[PDB]
């Protein structure tokens, strides 16, 4: 049975009191505050329950990267170049290195046909062409490995204006609504997007002869504002820009990670044991200070040792931002046990048999 009387009162009084500051002083480095505590008549306040409260805005800087590795074509090989075009002096010609994955129906002047309208009166036999902004996209492709090697192939390639970067870690923000990258040039306004089309046919097969050299590959070219936000080159062939054939082979690697964050257990956020700026707790009748502080009494380390001594430390409390810092046991002391690789480990080819033969 619990006690029944002379424990808890009945007159209305608060459980939690909040005091606004009375004086604030700012400086280049310091920042000082002063409040007026008021322990009312017939109460008892335990200072161990008080705690400050702060809030504001933080800018961790341009060297924040909490994730290891990158997140832009992580799976791509570390040296595969993007579908690109570049100039070369033989008095200057354009060379292309790209890839067309998509299979269409037939190629005409307008562009690679994709589908057809409904087989209906007044709508039967209406061809549909690719939209220049976003339609031939780098996602779709041939479904199964028994590809038929279509004759109407389309794709994309970045004009020679944009500099070349390795595919590993290369991002470029969308512009249109349908996720199609492309610079909106200012031409009578930002209304129009500049996307060109280029055609290609078989050399050898259509060299000696003509046959109206029908085209078989259509490349829609564009120009995007690409940037590498968290990767850097690890082998640059020549010091100069203006991409050439050699610059096709540059390779990148990710940036080392940082973890900028508030210090453990809020160390340094308050001045302690410094005669320059000393805290003040006193009676308002006469300002006889009650906090005399030397310059040798180290408070932070003492509080750390106490917090270890009276409790457990391997748990995390969010409220005080309390989480001890420790290293991995294996990083400091390596244990080289080799590995376990008795069996081989092979990568077979997709179909199941590689080279074959006719019979």
């Amino acid at each position: 049975v619990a006690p029944t009387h002379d424990v808890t009162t009945d007159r209305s009084q608060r459980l939690t009191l909040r005091f606004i500051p009375v004086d604030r002083e700012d400086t280049a480095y310091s920042y000082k505050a002063r409040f007026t505590l008021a322990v009312g008549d017939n109460r008892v306040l335990d200072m161990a329950s008080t705690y400050f409260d702060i809030r504001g805005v933080l800018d961790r800087g341009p060297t924040f990267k909490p994730y290891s590795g990158t997140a832009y074509n992580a799976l791509a090989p570390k040296g595969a170049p993007n579908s690109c075009e570049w100039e070369q002096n033989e008095a200057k010609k354009t060379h292309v290195y790209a890839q067309a994955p998509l299979s269409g129906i037939k190629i005409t002047k307008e562009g690679l046909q994709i589908g057809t309208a409904d087989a209906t009166v007044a709508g039967a036999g209406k061809e549909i062409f690719a939209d220049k902004t976003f339609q031939p996209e780098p996602q779709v492709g041939e479904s199964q490995w028994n590809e038929a090697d279509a004759t109407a192939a389309g794709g994309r390639v970045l004009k020679k204006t944009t500099p070349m970067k390795p595919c590993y870690g290369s991002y470029a923000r969308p512009t249109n609504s349908n996720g199609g990258q492309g610079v909106m040039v200012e031409q009578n306004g930002k209304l129009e997007s500049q996307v060109e089309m280029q055609f290609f046919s078989t050399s050898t097969n259509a060299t000696n002869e003509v046959n109206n050299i029908q085209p078989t590959v259509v490349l829609y070219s564009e120009d995007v504002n690409m940037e590498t936000p968290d990767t850097h080159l690890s082998y640059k062939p020549k010091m100069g820009d203006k991409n050439a054939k050699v610059m096709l082979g540059q390779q990148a690697m990710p940036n080392r990670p940082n973890y900028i964050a508030f210090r453990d257990n809020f160390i340094g956020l308050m001045y302690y044991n410094s005669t320059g700026n000393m805290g003040v707790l006193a009676g308002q009748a006469s300002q006889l200070n009650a906090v005399v502080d030397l310059q040798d009494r180290n408070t932070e380390l003492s509080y750390q040792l106490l917090l270890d001594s009276i409790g457990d430390r391997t748990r995390y409390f969010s409220m005080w931002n309390q989480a001890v810092d420790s290293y991995d046991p294996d990083v400091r002391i390596i244990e080289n046990h080799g590995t376990e690789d008795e069996l081989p480990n092979y990568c077979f080819p997709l179909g199941g048999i590689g080279i074959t033969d006719t019979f």
Partner: protein, 192 residues
């Protein structure tokens, strides 16, 4: 697993009083588990739980709160408790109304890691290689204006509201369960 979907709770006896009684909380009329945007700063633990609920829970589970907060001992805090199952979470996302070039993109037109991955299914790889366009950057020299979202997550426990004067657990037969100003009459109860 659904504890985290409560907003507020209100008690009322005889359709005239409020059980917390005389002014005793930051919000005297009713408890308040979590809340949306609040400029007065009533949140704690970097999550979005008000101080009142945190204090009530700590008092009801461990008699902790009138002499500062600290981690309770292991034996006093079992598996089906409140502190062991408390998780604050927060992240940052891209603001729209303050970023100029925001463009909502469906899942249909998202090509990241293209040319080495399926297409809306766990099928074989397809496609060319091309710069990516899905994950907006939040770091580096060219980040974007961002807002912050915070939430808390707790499971395997029941919220508790003890029937005592000062919320502490002073014994099985609570004192407020004996007073003849609350135990010698008849009353009806409303809750919302």
């Amino acid at each position: 697993y659904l504890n985290h979907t409560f907003k507020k709770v209100a008690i009322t006896f005889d359709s005239s009083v409020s059980w917390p009684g005389n002014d005793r909380l930051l919000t005297p009329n009713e408890f308040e588990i979590k809340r949306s945007v609040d400029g007065e700063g009533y949140n704690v633990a970097q999550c979005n739980m008000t101080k009142d609920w945190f204090l009530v829970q700590m008092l009801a589970n461990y008699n902790i709160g009138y002499q500062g907060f600290y981690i309770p001992e292991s034996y006093k805090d079992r598996m089906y408790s409140f502190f062991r199952n408390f998780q604050p979470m927060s992240r940052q996302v891209v603001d729209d109304t303050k970023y100029k070039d925001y463009q909502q993109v469906g899942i249909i037109h998202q090509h990241n890691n293209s040319g080495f991955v399926g297409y809306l299914a766990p099928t074989m790889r397809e496609g060319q290689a091309y710069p990516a366009n899905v994950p907006y950057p939040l770091i580096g020299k060219t980040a974007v204006d961002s807002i912050t979202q915070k939430k808390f997550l707790c499971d395997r426990t029941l919220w508790r509201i003890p029937f005592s004067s000062n919320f502490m657990s002073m014994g099985a037969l609570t004192d407020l369960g004996q007073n003849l100003l609350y135990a010698n009459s008849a009353h009806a109860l409303d809750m919302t």
